[PDB]
Amino acid sequence: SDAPPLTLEAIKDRVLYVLKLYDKIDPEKLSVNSHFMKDLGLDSLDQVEIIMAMEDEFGFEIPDIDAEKLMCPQEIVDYIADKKDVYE
Amino acid sequence: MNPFASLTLTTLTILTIPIMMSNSNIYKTNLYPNYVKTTVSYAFTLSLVPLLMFMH
Amino acid sequence: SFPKYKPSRLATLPATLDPAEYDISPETRKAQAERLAIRSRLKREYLLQYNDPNRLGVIEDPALIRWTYARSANIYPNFRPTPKTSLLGALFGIGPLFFWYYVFKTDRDKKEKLIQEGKLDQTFNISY
C-alpha cells in the first residue's frame, strides 16, 4: 500500500548513512553521540547544511528554531521519531 | 414503442440506484465503490445502444 | 543596485526589509523582553486551565468578548455627529437611493413613452 512503518532503527541508520556520505566528517570517528562542534569540529554554517541534508533525506522540513538546537545524530533521530510518531 | 426512449431514460435512472442504497447495508461495507463502478459500467454499456441507433 | 521593492496596503513590507530590525538600541530589546513577558504570562494562564483534568466546559477568553462588544455594543456610545461622519452617512445612505431612483425612473419613462407610440414589439409578451 503506502510507505512501510518506519521505525527507530531505520531513522538512525538513515541519519548515520547521510552523515557518513559527508566529506568533512570522518566515518570512523563519527558516532551517534558525536557532538557536531566539539567532537567533529564543524561550524554553524556546516550544521545548517547537515540539517538541510537530513531535511532532503527524510522529505520534511524542520523549523529553524528547532533546527539550531540539534547537535547530535541521536538528537536528530529523536526529533524525527517525535515528528513521525515512531515508538519503536 | 421503440426502445430508444426507454433505453435513454434507463441509462439515467439506473445511476440513481446506488444513491437509493446509501442507507442500506452496502454503504457500510467495503464493496460499495466496486458496486458504484459496476453500476457506471452497466450504464455506459446500456447507453451505447441509443448511440448505435442514432448512427444508424 | 537592484529595483527597490516598495510596500503597499495589500502587500506590506517584509520582516527582512524593514530598517527597524537593523537599527537596534537597548530600549528596543527591553520592549521586546516586556512583550515576551506579557505573552508568556498569558500563555501560562491559558495552559494552567487547559491542562486541568477537573475543568469541563469552555475556557472563556476576555479578548473575544471585548472584540464582540466593541464591534456591536460599544459603537453608538462612542459616536459623535461630526462633519466627516455627517457627510459620509448622508452620502453612503442617500446617494445610492436617488441614483437608482433616477436610473429606474428614466428607464421606465422611456419604456412607457415607447409603449404609448406603439413601438416596442411586445408580441408574445403574455406572461409578466
Binding site: 554554517l45 510518531d85 | - | 521593492y5 523582553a33 486541568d52
Partner: protein, 178 residues
C-alpha cells in the same frame, strides 16, 4: 514548533536563517543536482568571505544588502515540502484528528468493544488525575513572583514526578490519525 521562542534573534541566527533561505531558493532556481551543488558551494564561499568580520556595523550593512539581494532574486514559486505550511498537504489530515475526550461520550455498547483499550485509558486518566496538584505546585514554586519570562517549561525534578503540563502534549492524536 517544539522550542519556546526567544525575545529576539541575534545576528548569528539572522544570518543562518538567511543562508538557509538563500540556499533553498537557489535549489529552486537550480533544478538539477550538479548545478545546484556548484552554485551552493559558490554561495557558501560568498558567505564565508565575511565569516570573521568583527565590525558589527559593516556586518549589519552587508546583511541588509544580502537581504535586498535575496528579495530581488527570490524564486516566485519556491519549492515547498508537501506538509510544510505552503505545501500541498499542509493541513490535509486535520479533519481526521479527533480529541481523546470524545471517547468519554461513547455509548456503553461502543465501550463494550475494545475493553483493554478502555482499561488502559482508565489507567491513563488516573495517572493524569493523581499528578495534577504536584505539577501545579512545582510550577508555582519554580516561576518568579512577577511571572514567567519565557514560555519554557521545567522538567520533573523529583523521582515520582511528571513534567508539568504534559497531558495535551503527550495525548496528541497523530500525524496520520486515520
Amino acid at each position: 514548533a517544539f522550542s519556546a521562542p526567544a525575545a529576539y534573534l541575534t545576528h548569528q541566527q539572522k544570518v543562518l536563517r538567511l543562508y538557509k533561505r538563500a540556499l533553498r531558493h537557489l535549489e529552486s532556481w537550480c533544478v538539477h543536482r550538479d548545478k545546484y551543488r556548484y552554485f551552493a558551494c559558490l554561495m557558501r564561499a560568498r558567505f564565508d568571505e565575511h565569516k570573521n568580520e568583527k565590525d558589527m556595523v559593516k556586518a549589519t550593512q552587508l546583511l541588509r544588502q544580502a537581504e535586498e539581494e535575496f528579495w530581488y532574486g527570490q524564486h516566485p514559486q519556491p519549492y515547498i515540502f508537501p506538509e510544510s505550511p505552503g505545501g500541498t498537504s499542509y493541513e490535509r489530515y486535520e479533519c481526521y484528528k479527533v480529541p481523546e475526550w470524545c471517547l468519554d461520550d461513547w455509548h456503553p455498547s461502543e465501550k463494550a468493544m475494545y475493553p483493554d483499550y478502555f482499561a488502559k485509558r482508565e489507567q491513563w486518566k488516573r495517572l493524569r488525575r493523581e499528578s495534577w496538584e504536584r505539577e501545579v505546585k512545582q510550577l508555582q514554586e519554580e516561576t518568579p513572583p512577577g511571572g514567567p519570562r519565557t514560555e519554557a517549561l521545567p522538567p520533573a525534578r523529583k523521582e515520582g514526578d511528571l513534567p508539568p503540563l504534559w497531558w495535551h502534549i503527550v495525548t496528541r492524536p497523530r500525524e496520520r490519525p486515520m
